[PDB]
Amino acid sequence: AKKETIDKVSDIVKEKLALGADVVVTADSEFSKLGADSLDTVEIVMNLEEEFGINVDEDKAQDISTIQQAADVIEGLLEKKA
């Protein structure tokens, strides 16, 4: 993934965990540590899929733990295009 993609995802994720101004999310930050439960994570991929117009199964995003992890799955899909 790229530094640009991480910013996009983090923007959406942090927005779901907070307003974004009172929260601090990074590539090293874990969705579980940020305060995102199983009900939150599932929503993260949903908001992202609609953003990048991509699609991914939850069972496939299991390994996903940090922002970067979720960024790799997304950035990896957009590449499939063309």
Side-chain angles (χ1 to χ4, degrees), residues 1-2 5 54 70-80:
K2 46 262 273 272
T5 300
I54 61 170
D72 185 39
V73 179
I74 302 161
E75 74 86 29
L77 288 160
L78 283 86
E79 293 274 6
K80 204 164 279 173

Side-chain angles (χ1 to χ4, degrees), residues 1-12 48 51-52 67-68 70-76 78:
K2 46 262 273 272
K3 58 242 274 265
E4 285 305 327
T5 300
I6 302 163
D7 189 58
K8 313 216 74 79
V9 183
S10 268
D11 267 325
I12 302 135
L48 293 162
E51 204 282 282
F52 307 97
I67 304 296
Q68 265 270 254
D72 185 39
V73 179
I74 302 161
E75 74 86 29
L78 283 86

Side-chain angles (χ1 to χ4, degrees), residues 47-62:
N47 279 232
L48 293 162
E49 282 158 326
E50 195 196 26
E51 204 282 282
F52 307 97
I54 61 170
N55 68 113
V56 58
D57 209 306
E58 189 62 32
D59 210 78
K60 257 137 95 283
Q62 288 282 286

Side-chain angles (χ1 to χ4, degrees), residues 13-61:
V13 188
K14 74 196 299 208
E15 185 57 61
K16 301 276 280 93
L17 308 185
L19 297 159
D22 207 287
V23 67
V24 181
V25 181
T26 31
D28 208 48
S29 90
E30 311 175 37
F31 298 114
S32 206
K33 270 271 207 189
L34 294 184
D37 320 73
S38 198
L39 304 90
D40 224 291
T41 310
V42 58
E43 253 160 348
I44 307 313
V45 56
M46 202 190 296
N47 279 232
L48 293 162
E49 282 158 326
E50 195 196 26
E51 204 282 282
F52 307 97
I54 61 170
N55 68 113
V56 58
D57 209 306
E58 189 62 32
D59 210 78
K60 257 137 95 283

